[PDB]
Design a protein around this ligand. Structure first.
Ligand SMILES: O=C(O)[C@@H]1O[C@@H](O[C@H]2[C@H](O)[C@H](O)[C@H](O[C@H]3[C@H](O)[C@H](O)[C@H](O[C@H]4[C@H](O)[C@H](O)[C@H](O[C@H]5[C@H](O)[C@H](O)[C@H](O[C@H]6[C@H](O)[C@H](O)[C@H](O)O[C@H]6C(=O)O)O[C@H]5C(=O)O)O[C@H]4C(=O)O)O[C@H]3C(=O)O)O[C@H]2C(=O)O)[C@@H](O)[C@@H](O)[C@@H]1O
Ligand SMILES: [Ca+2]
Length: 496
């Protein structure tokens, strides 16, 4: 039952063999090289079956062969430590059952660089892989380096049934480095936990905070330069626990993506549609469990579909009129006049692709927000010129053509909570409301054509509130636990 869910419940499974660090022996400097040659000499169709044990500092491992599989002999029993990067240049390469821990990426784009087509990372575990690379404020502006753990640079990549635990230095955990055509990557059934910033005093450099406090997402799909092309990639059926990297939990920066059916539990970070068009966010379960700085989905740019999400028990910061509030659904302001067809454009100074595309043409329907401190927030935030230029942008615009239908914001338990935060500072343009139900405070409610303040009949189905005829259909929702997400083993005797 939802309120009573905890880390223990989501991560328990019987199906999970336990692998223990100690039954593994530390390979000598000599067997590492022997392992490395095996890697580098493999031919199309071959397979390496890493014998069990701990292998420190493989360094740079380049796989040039196609149709190969590198697996541990027993899943979870080959531990790759110190500095390593697998560089997967071949097509149809599969990594399976590996553990990356007690070490760090050998180059900043991660332990695994998936450069080929149809590359796969499955059944693998990353555990606090934060070590052994240089990590200092740089001389130029005191910026700490961005290190990722996995990056995808090819097509049809798969990252499935892994565990990604304790990323706690700067850098996005999975990055998609794409080009001008669809990538169709699948990132699914993974477990993500305990991403967290400022564990090494990074924020102590006050002047550098805006950038040092950025780039701690769990995944970024696309980036500013590539954002106006489709990725058509999927972030689905993942389980995320205490993922507190930064404001963006998932930063979508390309088009036609699906970010659907994830369970996001006690994670002080939001799904963020940051750049790019026509992304779909559906059937997620966002369970704040009353943790401060939790929230649902924040939205820039055009043509997105946000439907049938279940967002509960989220809470904003502890005690500014203009604050970028974390709500269940946040319709951001941006810096371009989209109501008159303005676009971001790499050629127009101040309006480059990495800036803020005022949301437009957004479908928001059949969501259930339950006990959310800030429910649906219509943004009034300002923006800075860039991460390196602190000047505020003059020229801020509200969302346009935002269609709300069949949403339930239920703050019946604490009706002082703000269910809808409308704002005369930036009235939405062309907003419409069809069968909305908002229970709880509505700020600037005279901005809203109509809505009901009485809940439909409420039932409980497998722990969820079901509102008759409205809100998220509970038939489409279910909690992801370690019964389908994550590797088939847990590791014991690991070190952070
Ligand atoms: O607390 C409050 O209430 C308010 O706080 C402040 O406002 C803050 C906001 O609340 C919110 O955080 C907001 O965040 C901004 C942010 O400042 C910035 O504009 C960012 O923009 C995205 C852009 O795309 C940007 O260029 C950058 O992306 C870079 C970056 O290097 C990133 O790591 C990534 O790198 C990869 C890329 O492939 C690259 O080419 C290179 O290869 O390396 C890759 C890698 O290392 O992974 O992509 C780059 C790029 O492609 O350009 O960051 C992006 C992102 O993080 O999404 O996000 C904005 C956002 O709204 O999310 O603004 C904060 C702020 O401090 O201004 C206060 O100002 C006030 O409003 C409130 O009090
Ligand atoms: Ca960010």
């Amino acid at each position: 039952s939802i309120s009573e869910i905890d880390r223990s419940y989501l991560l328990s499974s019987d199906r999970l063999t336990e692998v223990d660090g100690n039954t593994l022996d530390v390979a000598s400097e000599e067997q590492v090289a022997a392992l490395k040659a095996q890697f580098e000499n493999l031919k199309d169709g071959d397979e390496v079956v890493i014998p069990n044990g701990k292998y420190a500092n493989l360094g740079q491992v380049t796989i040039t062969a196609n149709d190969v599989t590198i697996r541990a002999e027993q899943a979870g029993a080959a531990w790759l430590t110190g500095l390593i990067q697998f560089e997967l240049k071949g097509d149809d390469i599969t990594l399976d059952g590996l553990v990356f821990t007690e070490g760090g990426p050998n180059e900043r784009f991660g332990a695994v660089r998936m450069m080929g087509n149809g590359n796969t990372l499955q059944n693998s575990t990353f555990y606090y892989f934060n070590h052994d690379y240089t990590y200092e404020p740089d001389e130029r502006r005191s910026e700490y380096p961005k290190y990722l753990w996995v990056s995808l640079w090819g097509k049809d990549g798969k990252v499935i049934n892994n565990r990604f635990e304790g990323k706690q230095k700067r850098g996005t955990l999975i990055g998609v480095q794409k080009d001008d055509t669809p990538d169709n990557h699948l990132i699914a059934n993974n477990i993500f936990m305990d991403q967290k910033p400022n564990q090494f005093n990074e924020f102590d450099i006050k002047e550098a905070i805006r950038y040092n406090g950025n780039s701690w997402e769990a995944i970024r799909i696309g980036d500013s330069k590539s954002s106006q092309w489709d990725s058509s990639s999927k972030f689905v059926n993942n389980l995320m626990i205490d993922m507190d990297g930064e404001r963006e939990l998932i930063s979508i920066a390309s088009g036609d993506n699906t970010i659907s059916g994830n369970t996001i539990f006690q994670s002080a970070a939001l799904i963020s549609l940051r750049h790019g068009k026509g992304n779909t966010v559906e059937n997620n379960m966002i369970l704040g469990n009353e943790k401060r700085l939790t929230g649902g989905i924040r939205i820039y740019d055009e043509d997105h579909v946000i439907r049938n999400n279940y967002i509960a028990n989220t809470r904003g910061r502890d005690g500014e009129g203009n604050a970028d509030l974390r709500g269940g659904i946040v319709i951001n302001t941006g810096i371009i006049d989209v109501a008159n067809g303005e676009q971001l454009d790499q050629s127009v100074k101040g309006k480059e692709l990495n800036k803020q595309w005022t949301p437009k043409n957004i479908t928001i329907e059949n969501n259930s927000l339950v006990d959310t401190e800030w429910g649906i927030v219509y943004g009034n935030q300002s923006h800075r010129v860039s991460l390196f230029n602190n000047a505020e942008v003059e020229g801020i615009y509200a969302g346009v053509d935002i269609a709300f239908k069949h949403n339930v914001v239920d703050n019946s338990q604490t009706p002082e909570f703000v269910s809808v935060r409308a704002t005369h500072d930036f009235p939405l343009v062309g907003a419409t409301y069809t069968d909305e139900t908002y229970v709880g405070q509505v700020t600037d409610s005279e901005l809203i054509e109509s809505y009901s303040v009485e809940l439909p009949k409420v039932t409980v189905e497998n722990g969820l509130n079901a509102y008759q005829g409205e809100g998220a259909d509970v038939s489409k929702l279910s909690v992801v636990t370690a019964e389908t997400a994550g590797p088939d083993y847990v590791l014991e005797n690991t070190t952070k």
